[PDB]
Amino acid sequence: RTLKVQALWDGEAGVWVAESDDVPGLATEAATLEELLAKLAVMVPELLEENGVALELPVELRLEATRPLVF
């Protein structure tokens, strides 16, 4: 169904890093969130096949980025 993937900002390395509890062996990053999305679109299917898929279709990727709010 929906595969939640977190994008964590790594200021030191200047890149967003993908992390997912729904996607096995996911290890990828990119300078921008757009590029991270692009890369994910390719890698995620592959990783799901290489591993025991077991997914309900059609599957969508939800890239999440969190920011702390100041009041």
Residues of this chain that bind its own copies (CB under 8 A): 2-3, 32-34, 37, 40-41, 44-45, 48-49, 57-71
Phi, psi of 41 (to 5 degrees): -55, -35
Shortest approach of its own copies to residue 16 CB, angstroms?
A: 9
Instruction: Give the C-alpha distances (Å, rounded to integers) separating 21 from 2, 14, 70.
Output: 12, 23, 28
Using the minimum distance from each CB to its own copies, give the nearer residue, 27 or 35.
35
Shortest approach of its own copies to residue 65 CB, angstroms?
A: 5
Shortest approach of its own copies to residue 5 CB, angstroms?
A: 10
Using the minimum distance from each CB to its own copies, give the nearer residue, 27 or 38.
38
User: What letter does residue 9 receive in the DSSP assignment?
Assistant: E
Q: Is 38 left (phi over 0), alpha (psi -120 to 50) or beta?
A: alpha
